[PDB]
Amino acid sequence: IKNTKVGLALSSHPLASEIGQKVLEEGGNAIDAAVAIGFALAVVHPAAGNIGGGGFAVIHLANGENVALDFREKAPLKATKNMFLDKQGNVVPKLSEDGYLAAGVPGTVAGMEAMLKKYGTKKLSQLIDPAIKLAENGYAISQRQAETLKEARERFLKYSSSKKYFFKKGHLDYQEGDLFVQKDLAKTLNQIKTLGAKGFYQGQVAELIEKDMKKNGGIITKEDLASYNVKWRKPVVGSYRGYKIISMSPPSSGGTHLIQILNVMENADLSALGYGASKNIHIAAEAMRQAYADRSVYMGDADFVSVPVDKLINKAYAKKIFDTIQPDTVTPSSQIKPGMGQLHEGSN
Amino acid sequence: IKNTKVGLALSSHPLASEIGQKVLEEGGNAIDAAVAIGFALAVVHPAAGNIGGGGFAVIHLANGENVALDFREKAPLKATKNMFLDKQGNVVPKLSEDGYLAAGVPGTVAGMEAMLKKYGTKKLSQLIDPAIKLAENGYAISQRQAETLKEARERFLKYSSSKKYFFKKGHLDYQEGDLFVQKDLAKTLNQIKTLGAKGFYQGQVAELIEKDMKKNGGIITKEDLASYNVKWRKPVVGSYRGYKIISMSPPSSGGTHLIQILNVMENADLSALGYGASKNIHIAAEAMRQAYADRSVYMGDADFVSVPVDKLINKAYAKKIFDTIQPDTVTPSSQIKPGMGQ
Amino acid sequence: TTHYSVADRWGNAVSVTYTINASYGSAASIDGAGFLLNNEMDDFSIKPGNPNLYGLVGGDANAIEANKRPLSSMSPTIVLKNNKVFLVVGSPGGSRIITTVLQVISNVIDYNMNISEAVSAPRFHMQWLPDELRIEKFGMPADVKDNLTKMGYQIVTKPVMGDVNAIQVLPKTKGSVFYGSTDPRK
């Protein structure tokens, strides 16, 4: 895949990639293309692409600024610490996984609109048109999609809504090559086309959400939807062998641990032995081990709890981790101490 | 790449693969498609695809028969043992590599017609049309083609004929994306369309070959061309872990040593350690080492020399090779004996 | 989960990872609206020490609170070289996202792989609990496995990890060339 003219827009579905690429061809910028792709994947890749979930965008601007958009789902206004436990304090099987209580307040539609308005050049109404066309007129189920739909069968069958949408008539599995048409999804996307994010978080669509939640034991209401907020955040930034690394900050742990593990690895000359050498794998893997132990104690939504991001991404901390890594030997996980005695804020 | 209806026709150039696939879609058989591809690659992949060379086809027929076609080039009638040596018996640098004396009598056109006539279902005239269209109308030079043309530049520059065909005006390199048109090649392909293989081995094309050879210190004559013959040969056949291996026999060494090497490997359970294990690589590499030593002494055109194919592919011989392989040390090449005593 | 990467002619780059969590999320759709609900609540620690769908654990920091965002592992990333876009990269894979993305970056920077090579290269993974070195089929030869086992790794072969969509941007004579790679694992 190569371009020397307008750049590249690349996704896991060729129809969405083509939609993004055409936006670039037509003169839109990377944000315009990204917004087109987000809506297109919500139609063509429903296992993952979505309007019912959320995520993050890390953005580097032409002028040199780096910014991050948090459009992560929020726990509902009525969520509680022990909401997935029974009277005895034990996990209720599948309650956090299957069905309506498992859902956080969706952020995707808000995220798409937010980055478009701040950094895009084109109108949402136009960028959403390709996704609407695919919803209304259909697209061919792929081989992999047929497999993943089949695997989800028993889960879909629990919910009358999903039975209607994700099975053919007679609740048959979609097959490779079948044309998949999504009329109600098209209606929803048309509300967003017309009204913007307000077409999702307010009005008729918000009413559908509240009603179905109430019907099915969920807790998300119109209030939750009206309270949904994206957050513009600073990305986490580091360096690796002279290259600048820009990645997602809390409420993701991803960028922080990525920078942390690379920081540890930087202390070794990996190039000496090359790809796939056990000596190199050991350094990276022992770095990973400490990072995930740290994650278990020190990571969360930094708006609500103390998260020591700056300490976790500091090269001095990584050098301490590197020093604890003994040649030719692992530290068993049961012997790993989250924080390595470096993340104590006094007796807190 | 997947097909569940007509099968697959796969080559190193998408235009040629498309041509072959279309033949299958239109109801031609595997031989029909192979013939269309052989001519298409002569146009779109001139580094390798050709009408001026030769090769082999191994064919498994619907009825269960397995056959091999030898359309390998022949040394010309005037060829001699020491033809590439000087008065003192030393190699003349590049004489066997560059220019007209380096050529054997071409077999490709004879090979394409032979397999079509024996096992195909469509007419040559129709199967060759896509190739002619590509020669007459042109196709786009690829990125890789631009590279390989650039690499061949100083070789092409030695021959007025090649300077005419493979450069732009003023002997300039073709660049990526340029349209490459081959009008004289189209003339030659049209002679084959109308007249079959005789359109290459006789008539105007044979005259062009003979006279350009004479002018340029080559030795191929009309008599060479008129006497060019393919040979239908039995393939060499082996087995590996319950699978039947069908491959090319002399004058290729390929099938014999492929079967020999696999025979040696068969004595180990390679699956146990899996892909890329040094112990597995070692067994294969030691088998290879013996096979190539054997190649250097025993292998040639069996119509002229005695080639012990049956001995080389005998599993008992392979077991003997296997038993010499040391767990964690090699047999240096200097210590290999061809045939081990065979 | 899915990741997409965009780079334009003005020098902007956008790296987006987004998700409904599990494949098809909660499997419940909003009736009349045609879309699947996420099961992102499972990304909280719902009980201290309880492993979630990816075997991740927590305590106080990632406990559920009203309006709080559940901890993610999503790692949409941009790499710069001399202040210019160099890589745009990210991946799905739950707990494996972090390790997938860093291996692609290391493959380019440490081993000088092009973006296709960097994405196609076999991946390993260690997440502390479970205490295992996770690898891919055909990803590690016997000799490497034996040496890592002798160091104390418990090696386990599991399904392929990730689905990287990545862009590499290089200076040419005038301006930039954009090279792309999707993941063979898709």
Next chain:
Amino acid sequence: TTHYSVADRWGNAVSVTYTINASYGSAASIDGAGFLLNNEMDDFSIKPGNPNLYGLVGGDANAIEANKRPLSSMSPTIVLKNNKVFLVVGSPGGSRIITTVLQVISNVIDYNMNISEAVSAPRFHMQWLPDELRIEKFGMPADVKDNLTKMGYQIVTKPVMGDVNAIQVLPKTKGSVFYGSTDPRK
């Protein structure tokens, strides 16, 4: 050199390797006819013990004689399972053809790779003279190289080997399915 493979719905399979030898053959064309001449005469032994373009040597068996066909390494191959087509495989590469083809076949049979995996997998090569183990970039990790070096191999990294176009055929309840791979090397 180039290899092509064809399989049809009736159970015919055709594996063709053909060539003008070197890239662009002898580099000389027939004036008026528009085609390049082969340099296939270099595939003979032109003097006992003299290495040709691929480092291959010979004596009497592959000496030049009028009308004789020069020895080839071309290995167009068909593999059958219960007398039905299973693989159609071949490659260019001079002396490396034999080892390339057998590695693809071994990858399928020994390691249960699908045809795409079998073709993409790194290749090694030993041809007795030179006495070296030829490998590909990124093809062998340090641990494997170290162990082979200890055995007494001289390991050398050289340009990628071959260009396999291969078909795998698998029976279905109705008919067969045909799977194809071209080579990521070229």
